[PDB]
Ligand binder design. Structure first.
Ligand SMILES: *[C@H](CC(=O)OC)[C@@H](C[C@@H]1CCNC1=O)NC(=O)[C@H](CC(C)C)NC(=O)OCc1ccccc1
Length: 180
């Protein structure tokens, strides 16, 4: 319940629907002009954001100290409107909760919310043939078209959905030090 009400408030304020040449994604703005997409969104020099073309000033494919994939891409957008600073909702390490929701905002899933239930720190995962770390896991049959969805519990933004088998979901932890 409370995690659901928090998600709807957060997605109305900070989320948008983004199209790259590789698909449609939920995008979460973090602070200033910095937002986060799953790495496989592979944004080019311009993206489509709320159906309007937006130039990309920089894109950082996040990787740990040994070069291990984190399945996160940080982009600075060439636009004047600043994002509401939600870095205080970002934890310093991988968050576990008992009740979380996954929130999605694309043409295929418009403002759709999801009772993932328990979220635990998974860690390493061979994700699509790519060794990846800092994964968060939930037991929900997550679908395609859902990557970029924002994993949240009440008062917390846990990470970004990046993959899943048939009956499991996996999020890349959205950590505070990623954005200074
Ligand atoms: C991203 C789909 C999307 O939004 O594309 C526009 C999701 C969906 C998955 C697949 C079904 N359940 C989901 O939620 N992620 C993927 O498709 C990823 C892509 C990688 C490049 C990150 N692949 C994936 O989930 O592979 C399945 C898997 C294999 C091994 C271990 C875990 C999952």
């Amino acid at each position: 319940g409370p995690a659901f009400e928090f998600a709807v408030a957060m997605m109305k304020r900070n989320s948008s629907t983004v199209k790259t040449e590789y698909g449609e994604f939920t995008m979460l703005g973090i602070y200033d002009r910095w937002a986060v997409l799953p790495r496989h969104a592979k944004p080019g020099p311009t993206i489509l954001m709320n159906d309007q073309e937006v130039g990309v000033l920089d894109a950082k494919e996040l990787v740990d100290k040994d070069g291990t994939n984190l399945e996160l891409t940080l982009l600075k957008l060439n636009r004047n409107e600043k994002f509401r600073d939600i870095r205080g909702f970002l934890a310093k390490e991988e968050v576990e909760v008992n009740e979380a929701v996954l929130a999605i905002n694309t043409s295929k899933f418009p403002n759709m919310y999801i009772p993932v239930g328990q979220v635990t720190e998974y860690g390493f995962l061979n994700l699509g043939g790519t060794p990846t770390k800092r994964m968060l896991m939930y037991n929900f049959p997550t679908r395609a078209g859902q990557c970029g969805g924002v994993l949240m519990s009440t008062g917390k933004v846990l990470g970004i959905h990046v993959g899943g088998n048939g009956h499991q979901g996996f999020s890349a932890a959205l950590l505070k030090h990623y954005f200074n």
